[PDB]
Design a protein around this ligand. Sequence first.
Ligand SMILES: [Cl-]
Ligand SMILES: [Cl-]
Ligand SMILES: [Cl-]
Ligand SMILES: [Cl-]
Ligand SMILES: [Cl-]
Ligand SMILES: [Cl-]
Lengths: 523, 526
Amino acid sequence: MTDFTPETPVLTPIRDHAAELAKAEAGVAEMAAKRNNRWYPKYHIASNGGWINDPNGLCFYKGRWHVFYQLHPYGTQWGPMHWGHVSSTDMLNWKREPIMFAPSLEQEKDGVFSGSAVIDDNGDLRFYYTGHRWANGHDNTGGDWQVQMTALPDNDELTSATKQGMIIDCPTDKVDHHYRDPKVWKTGDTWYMTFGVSSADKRGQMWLFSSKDMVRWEYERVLFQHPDPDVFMLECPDFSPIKDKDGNEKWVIGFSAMGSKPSGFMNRNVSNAGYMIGTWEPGGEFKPETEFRLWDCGHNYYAPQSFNVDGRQIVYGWMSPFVQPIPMEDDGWCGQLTLPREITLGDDGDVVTAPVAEMEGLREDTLDHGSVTLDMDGEQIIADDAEAVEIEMTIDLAASTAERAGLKIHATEDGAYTYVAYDGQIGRVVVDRQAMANGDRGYRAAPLTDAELASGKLDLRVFVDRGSVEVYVNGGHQVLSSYSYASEGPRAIKLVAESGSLKVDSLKLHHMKSIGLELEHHH
Amino acid sequence: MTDFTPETPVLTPIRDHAAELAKAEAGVAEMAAKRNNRWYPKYHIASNGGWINDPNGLCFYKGRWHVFYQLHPYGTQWGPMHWGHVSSTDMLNWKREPIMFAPSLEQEKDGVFSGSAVIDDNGDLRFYYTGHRWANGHDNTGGDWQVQMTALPDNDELTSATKQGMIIDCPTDKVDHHYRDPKVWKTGDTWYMTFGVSSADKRGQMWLFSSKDMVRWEYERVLFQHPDPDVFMLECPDFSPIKDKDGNEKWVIGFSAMGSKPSGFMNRNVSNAGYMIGTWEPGGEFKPETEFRLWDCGHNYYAPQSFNVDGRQIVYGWMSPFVQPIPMEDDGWCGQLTLPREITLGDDGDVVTAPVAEMEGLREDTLDHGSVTLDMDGEQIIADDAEAVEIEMTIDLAASTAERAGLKIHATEDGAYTYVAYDGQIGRVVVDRQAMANGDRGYRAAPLTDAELASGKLDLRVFVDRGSVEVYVNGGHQVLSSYSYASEGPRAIKLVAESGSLKVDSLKLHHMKSIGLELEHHHHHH
Ligand SMILES: [Cl-]
Ligand SMILES: [Cl-]
Ligand SMILES: [Cl-]
Ligand SMILES: [Cl-]
Ligand SMILES: [Cl-]
Ligand SMILES: [Cl-]
């Protein structure tokens, strides 16, 4: 009826969903068949073929972990949006599932955009997602035209769903196009949805709705507007309560912000995700108590989604390749997710995102190097050939006189490498790709607080996969995720000290198992 | 000892200077004969053999430019100090002169330390230099024992000089050993002297003496005390008036400071030389109007000395290797000077040190690339084997989206290189040695002001020599000088853009001429 919030869903089939699924399966299979594994992850989620982006429909349900993701089943760049799907009983051994969604309704005809999953009062899962149309009916040049949809699984395995159609329409004149990425949750006795919006005045907002049956929605208010007028859109919003060190609940608002200008080491990527911590009276505005901070300070990270399982809030991000050249796109796939992280609040009151505990189960072994000291400028080989490894190290900052020091990873015979370092001139942990022979380069620098610098010790937990590095700083107080497209031959890891000494109190290497998604793998 | 300024110089010969000089000449010629030239400069002043340090006795005198330097004629580490000497009519073609000074007087018996040369009221040159003894008669554990000495040239070509002896003794009760590096100049009717002192309370100071005849000196006051208590000593002090284009003079005090702790990008080297700008009325104390700023932001630069000729103030620095490993020391030499730079004041009132204009005469050719665009992250090859070259480039900061961009030099087949880059996250120009296969590494970052960063353009003039790089930013507003010990094989130069585009409005390469100091008859190119 043009009520922005229809009283019952608007279901408008226009394509055979089974046949569209079958065509998507074929597209993925053509790319998987010719895939080059040189940079393909051994222990991160990627499509078996094609481009992926945002994680979606994240849940634990009926005895399995489920990860869905935005998928272009016909090439290795972004294109008509589908949802792909992997599942696991343990977060360690994963299986590929049928493609879940292809566009089949009028309001999503140009893409099945990002969405989430939530378990209702009866223990039944519901999906919420955005349906995308080109505003001009053609291509991106006239902008987006977006609405919110819902669907219900057909089975406990979540291998297929019945779509129910549009539940929240777009009031065209109140929005500047962008209108997407829903999250639904229950607080007290009321169900709430939020999603991202660009206002009529082009400000990034999260809107709030409420529902009693999860299907018919009512507009409540604007939950949050981003204080920087350069920020015009908040994609992939997140909102959840997290227990602080005193046992009090804080609300952590999250989004993937479009429009910020880079400043110093902050907001360096094309778009940038992060958080603020604050308070919320249910039904009211979010009241921030902190300035914006990045979820991840690395080169390649965006669109994180979080979900709750038995009191734990767990988050995946997409490692987003927004900058040319992207050489993995020649290899029949593009895009992986980060490892799953747990969102906690540390003793200093700030968000901490350590890997979930289950990730310890990736370790095949432990090579304990003990304490290592470099007395002056130099290097030591820690590994002659590391395809997929985790390094844990603690550096004694107070004793080490090196100006910069850390690990060169993917250090190949042509002299290329990616450098994970503490840099003492700036008091930050960097990932620096200047010497890489493939992909775009640059560096990214994660902040250390005065207390972290005064502590005298610095912990790094570094996950190297075939095409990527993730650096967890001080137990995931900060994280930097970045692609690292190793050159050919053996891929060394080297401990490095520049212009002074380096005292490493503890250094351990673990080889990483496969999560079973690459299938049979060679060497 | 309140007469620590003798009415007449104290001359105490203890060795035969001519025989000591002859021994030093043999030391240097033997190192030169075996020298390895892989990192040896083509167009910077080094010893032909042995270690050097501070530039000394700089002047233009009787039609010639003269450069002397601290020299250890018997090895490639610091050792018994001598003065070596090179001269030229044109700053482009230099001639190796005889060693000028060897230790031969009581008060300098453990070394002829640093010093300067000034032209007196009659137009005759006079040398002033510090004589060194160990306080404990044998080594450094007892610290230094230092006094000021003077000497006169024997001929207009300064091929030799006659020592006169000590003119200023050390009131050892008042000073904590350090007492060195004199500079003499005239203001008004009066001659002044300054040198560096560590006070009794271990504060770095510069003292001011006066004279009307240049040989008899009189204590006036402490000219300056370093406001950072960590700084115990101010070596190689400089003090000179610099004109703006506005017709005012400012006094620029300079010092090579010991004791400062590193902080952020500032004061990163073992010791660090820099300046303050302010005012001075003759006889009074220096009044600083600026905070301390580095002369040179690079890895390897210390002990600058400047001199005045015809309204120009010209400065050389020693490229100081303070940090292990120092690979050139295995090659029969160690250390080189920077190119000569002119001190001026720029539009913001800060010191600028461009290369002197005579350095244009080093260019053998010009390979003009015109404007060059990288549309995205990438590299273009500028040279495949650049031994000694100058690259001039103007970056269009307004149009370049690259996060970091510039030149990789000494870029060898093993993947090693030294990177000279504008870094847009820190708003600085860096020299980063992280990828070098020889020498200590790390990076140095020279500041750019808010006005420079909002300029549409950034100028870089980069001199690569066999073992070094010097990067002159925005016409010398900042400079970075750093050793870069290239690996073997062809040494490429690459233009680099990271993570965005790079628009270069002009890019030119010039091959550099030899300055004629690398000549060695045992080395047969052949
Ligand atoms: Cl920051
Ligand atoms: Cl491995
Ligand atoms: Cl490869
Ligand atoms: Cl600084
Ligand atoms: Cl060439
Ligand atoms: Cl050359």
